[PDB]
Nucleic acid binder design. Structure first.
Ligand code: ZN
Length: 1025
DNA sequence: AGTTTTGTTTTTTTTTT
DNA sequence: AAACAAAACT
RNA sequence: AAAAAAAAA
DNA sequence: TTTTTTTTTTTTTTTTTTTTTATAAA
DNA sequence: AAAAAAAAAAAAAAAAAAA
DNA sequence: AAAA
């Protein structure tokens, strides 16, 4: 079955013919007999046909010469076989050689092209490095599977039948009781969209909307069953988008889809560590056509605008701007409340939904949309999409016969996640509204539910009544919706005053009772909150220790191993900090850093100090992750939510408020509080406050009255001013005291303020006039804000907040280090200006795109290499002399520059620079460090010199302790290797004008010095010419 | 008059369902 | 993490 | 080897 | 209830102790 | 020669007792 | 070598 191979899109001739036929198809074809839906499927057939014609022709053309020579040789060899003479064997000898020349040249090019691709990526956080740490990828092929007989089979036709029949049954059964659905939907109170909102859904599609979706499609994804890729639509969006608009407008008008929109391919993937004998162990994934995903993406974006009107904030899955940790922290706070309570009669239930996305009944889903008030053009298009979807299984690369999808949301569809949530919201609203299912009361807060997609946790009081009523309600929803739970797989914590009462409740209820812990949303919830460290963080250390112990022999430099820690370990560490930000002992961070460094330095002591790696200006932009500062950044981030004071944030309100509530709304940028007895038992919030204050005093800020203090603050409320005055000021003039104005500004700065000024209570204005015009209030409020203050006050989005705080903490907690560049300046008798030390650092960043070439320079500048001087100190044995055996003290400058065995190579390099006709002094700082004197700092040739010198550095380092000269031919070979890698990259990324500038003059010199014997032996020949 | 800093944009991988 | 463009500070 | 949201580099 | 003094913890700096056997390619 | 670890000193917060 |  055909797929477009994306490489064809690159090729300027193939591209030109497609543009010709795309225009020519449509302008020929458009006549009033076809519907536009039929005309679109006809267009796709012609395109698929033409791509086959172009691929076949191109392959035939590229081979044409070897095709000819094979014939030409074969008749001459048969002419000899009939009539033999020596010159026929001469001719055979020549042509058969040229056959070998052509065939090897093609073999080289493919090997050099793949090497070039790897050369750009090596040691970078990219798919090659990701694959290195992963296991070997298990093949799709399925040899053997079991029958429901309890029997085992290997016959291909039996296994094809048994898989297909199983999936065909799951999707088959559509409910018919529509009258009973309407009753359930009427029973409860549900939201509605207003007119203005409904006008937004039903508005006509436009071209700008389509191109915005095309531009954002992910690249390198599998195509659907018609085999066109996202890269095709991106490439021809100029010609296609006019016709795509005509298609969607015809769908709006008529409610009819093209037949291809219904098709999908199901691929089966085996589950890890699971027994392939059983069909249940595979997981399906569905591939839909890209044109159908474009339409579905349009619809999902429209409904996403409204979704916060429809869905309560107890649901956080798939919702823009919500966080999964909101439910984790709320749940831990509920468990603490129960642990503290004197009378315990409570239950916490984690509910196991079964295959929820597949089992939703489509008629109930469409009725739900009407009750929320979605109807018209938007509802008509959604109804068309569910009219007749079908799937084909693809097993062992073989396409099985299709079956209808009569239940479920479409498993690979943009629109399915939100449609599932909207249906589940009907159940969530029923549970909240039923007063005989009792929630848990936390001061002014009641908590019943938290949801994440289909995952559900429930918090109940008086369980023996309350849990029975919950099960009844779910049974009723199951009948109409199709949604189903496995009650024995569901786990609960049960709290009772004594064990007789426990035995009774357990007798009646079906659930599995958990004694220590329950896995939830990636973490462990514990029955007592005192065990959070033991169940969450002690295991996380053990997991990282064993994971790095597996990797220890991977073929990777210290540069690549640093990137492994950032790629694999850092994300799971951050996730655990963000879910459970409890006070952690210092030993946790000591074990974590020791483990991580021991891996990076391959169990030998560090070659470069962690303090130099700490900072991005040093070591050419290679940097080591600081886990203490990521921890501190995560703990402090909570203060942003306190200042925002949002009603969606109920996780923040759920902590014990025994002494005094609401204190967190007042803390940030506001008057200090007399009493310290608040927050006595706080798990999260009291520790957040202590970290916030410590950073403010490290900055020597005054945190308590600021250019960002609110009008809704203790500062104003300690004045006795009526709440109507406060709300008047916010509604008219904005929310900061600075928006009022202090001192001479007090209202005068705008006419809107003095327009407001008359409106306020006579006596309140005198109180406010006194405070705002005082000397200290003017001084404190008028100062310029720091970048730290700007983070918490200014930003409307929580996005990016850990990375923003972490970059500040790096500047604040910065520490002093030795500089290797200074030691080099002592090693030579010279002083480097601050401008030279800057050039050394910039060169170390910009000498290459490849980390392979950059690493060699970084090691040279940062004094990586061992020397006999250093080695004699370590062994404390006084032989400090040069391993090469010239009879001299082996300083690092001797090893690189001065040794008489190395000196003939560096003189060779200087002969090439004179053939380039550059006049450059013979100074060790230019090749070793990239420090040019002031005349040459700007020059146009530095790109060339950088390649010559780094090639020479490789050549010396390869024989570091060997008693022989490095040789000119080894240097030429290394330099030509780099040339080859850069050439294929320069084509692939269309940089070729730059490449020719750098290499062209150097290439001419390298070729002029070699003999044809040497060029043949080492395959040195031009790729430009 | 030039260089440096700050923010957005395009590209990778990992967390949950 | 990289690159590119705009504005302020040296 | 697909969909959604979130996070980092 | 606030003020004053002492005690405890955390962080920063200084000083001492111990090391690895060549490197790049893979 | 160079990096990391360990100990000592300094500062700030909390508690205890008296005014 | 460490991709599809
Ligand atoms: Zn020597």
């Amino acid at each position: 079955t055909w797929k477009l191979n994306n490489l064809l899109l690159n090729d300027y001739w193939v591209h030109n013919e497609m543009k010709a036929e795309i225009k020519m198809f449509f302008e020929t074809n458009e006549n009033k007999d076809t519907t536009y839906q039929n005309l679109w499927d006809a267009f796709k057939a012609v395109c698929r046909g033409k791509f086959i014609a172009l691929n076949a022709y191109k392959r035939k053309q590229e081979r044409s010469k070897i095709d000819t020579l094979t014939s030409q040789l074969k008749e001459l060899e048969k002419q000899e076989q009939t009539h033999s003479k020596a010159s026929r064997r001469q001719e055979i000898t020549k042509i058969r050689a040229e056959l070998k020349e052509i065939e090897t040249q093609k073999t080289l090019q493919k090997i050099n092209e793949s090497r070039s691709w790897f050369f750009e990526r090596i040691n970078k956080i990219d798919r090659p490095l990701a694959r290195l740490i992963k296991k070997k990828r298990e093949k799709n092929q399925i040899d053997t599977i079991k029958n429901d007989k309890g029997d085992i089979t290997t016959d291909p036709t039996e296994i094809q039948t048994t898989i297909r029949e199983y999936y065909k049954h799951l999707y088959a059964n559509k409910l018919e009781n529509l009258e009973e659905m309407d009753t359930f939907l009427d029973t409860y109170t549900l939201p509605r969209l207003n007119q203005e909102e409904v006008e937004s859904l039903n508005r006509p599609i436009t071209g700008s909307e389509i191109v915005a979706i095309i531009n954002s499609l992910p690249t390198k994804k599998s195509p659907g069953p018609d085999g066109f890729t996202a890269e095709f639509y991106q490439r021809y969006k100029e010609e296609l988008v006019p016709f795509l608009l005509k298609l969607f407008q015809s769908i709006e008008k008529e409610g009819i889809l093209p037949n291809s929109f219904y098709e999908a391919s199901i691929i089966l993937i085996p589950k890890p560590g699971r027994d392939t004998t059983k069909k249940e162990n595979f997981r399906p994934i569905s591939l839909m056509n890209i044109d159908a995903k474009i339409l579905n993406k349009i619809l999902a974006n429209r409904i996403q605008q409204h979704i916060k009107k429809l869905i309560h904030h107890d649901q956080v899955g798939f919702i823009p701007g919500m966080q999964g940790w909101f439910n984790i922290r709320k749940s831990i706070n509920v468990i603490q409340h129960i642990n503290r309570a004197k009378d315990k009669n409570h239950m916490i239930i984690s509910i196991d939904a079964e295959k929820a996305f597949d089992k939703i009944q489509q008629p109930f889903m469409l009725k739900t949309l009407n009750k929320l008030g979605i109807d018209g053009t938007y509802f008509k298009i959604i109804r068309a999409i569910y009219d007749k979807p079908t799937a084909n299984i693809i097993l062992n690369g073989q396409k099985l016969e299709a079956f209808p999808l009569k239940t479920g949301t479409r498993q690979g569809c943009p629109l399915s996640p939100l449609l599932f949530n909207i249906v589940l919201e009907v159940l969530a609203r029923a549970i909240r509204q039923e007063k005989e299912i009792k929630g848990i009361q936390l001061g002014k807060e009641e908590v019943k539910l938290s949801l994440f997609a289909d995952d559900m946790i429930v918090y109940l009081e008086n369980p023996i009544v309350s849990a029975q009523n919950l099960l009844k309600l779910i049974s009723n929803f199951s009948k109409v919706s199709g949604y189903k739970i496995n009650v024995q797989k569901s786990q609960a914590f049960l709290y009772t005053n004594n064990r007789q009462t426990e035995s009774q409740i357990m007798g009646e209820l079906p659930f599995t009772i958990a004694s220590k812990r329950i896995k939830y949303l990636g973490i462990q919830l514990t029955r007592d909150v005192k065990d959070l460290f033991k169940e969450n963080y002690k295991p996380l250390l053990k997991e990282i220790k064993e994971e790095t112990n597996k990797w220890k022999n991977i073929p990777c430099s210290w540069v690549g191993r640093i990137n492994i820690v950032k790629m694999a370990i850092l994300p799971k560490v951050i996730y655990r900090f963000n879910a459970i930000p409890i006070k952690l002992p210092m030993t946790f961070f000591t074990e974590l850093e020791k483990t991580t460094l021991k891996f990076i330095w391959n169990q030998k002591r560090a070659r470069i100090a962690k303090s130099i790696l700490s900072q991005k200006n040093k070591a050419g932009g290679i940097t080591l992750p600081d886990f203490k500062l990521y921890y501190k950044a995560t703990v402090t981030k909570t203060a942003w939510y306190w200042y925002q004071n949002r009603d969606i944030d109920q996780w923040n309100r759920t902590e014990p408020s025994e002494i005094m509530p609401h204190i967190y709304n007042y803390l940030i940028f506001d008057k200090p509080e007399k009493n310290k007895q608040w927050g006595k038992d706080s798990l999260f919030n009291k520790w957040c406050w202590e970290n916030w204050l410590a950073i403010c005093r490290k900055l020597k800020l005054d945190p308590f009255l600021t250019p960002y203090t609110k009008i809704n603050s203790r500062w104003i409320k300690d004045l006795n001013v009526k709440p109507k005055t406060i709300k008047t000021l916010e509604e008219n003039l904005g929310i900061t005291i600075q928006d009022i104005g202090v001192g001479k500004d007090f209202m005068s700065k705008t006419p809107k303020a003095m327009a407001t000024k008359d409106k306020i209570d006579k006596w309140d204005l005198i109180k406010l006039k006194s405070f705002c015009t005082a000397k200290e209030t003017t001084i404190r409020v008028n100062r310029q804000p720091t970048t730290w203050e700007k983070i918490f006050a200014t930003y409307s989005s929580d996005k990016g907040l850990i990375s923003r705080i972490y970059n500040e903490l790096k500047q604040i907690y910065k520490k002093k280090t030795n500089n290797p560049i200074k030691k080099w300046a002592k090693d030579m008798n010279r002083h480097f200006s601050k401008e030279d030390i800057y050039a050394a650092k910039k060169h170390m960043k910009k000498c290459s795109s490849s980390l392979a070439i950059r690493e060699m320079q970084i090691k040279t500048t940062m004094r990586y290499h061992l020397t006999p001087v250093r080695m004699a100190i370590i062994k404390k044995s006084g032989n400090n002399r040069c391993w090469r055996g010239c009879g001299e003290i082996g300083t690092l400058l001797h090893c690189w520059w001065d040794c008489k065995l190395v000196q003939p190579l560096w003189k060779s390099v200087w002969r090439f620079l004179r053939d380039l006709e550059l006049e450059i002094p013979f100074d060790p700082a230019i090749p070793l460090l990239g420090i040019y004197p002031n005349e040459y700092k700007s020059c146009c040739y530095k790109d060339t010199c950088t390649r010559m010198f780094i090639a020479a550095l490789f050549t010396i380092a390869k024989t570091w302790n060997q008693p022989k000269c490095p040789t000119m031919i080894d240097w030429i070979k290394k330099m030509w290797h780099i040339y080859t890698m850069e050439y294929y990259a320069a084509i692939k990324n269309d940089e070729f004008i730059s490449f020719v500038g750098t290499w062209m003059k150097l290439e001419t010199i390298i070729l002029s010095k070699l003999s044809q014997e040497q060029k043949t032996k080492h395959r040195i020949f031009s790729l430009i010419g």
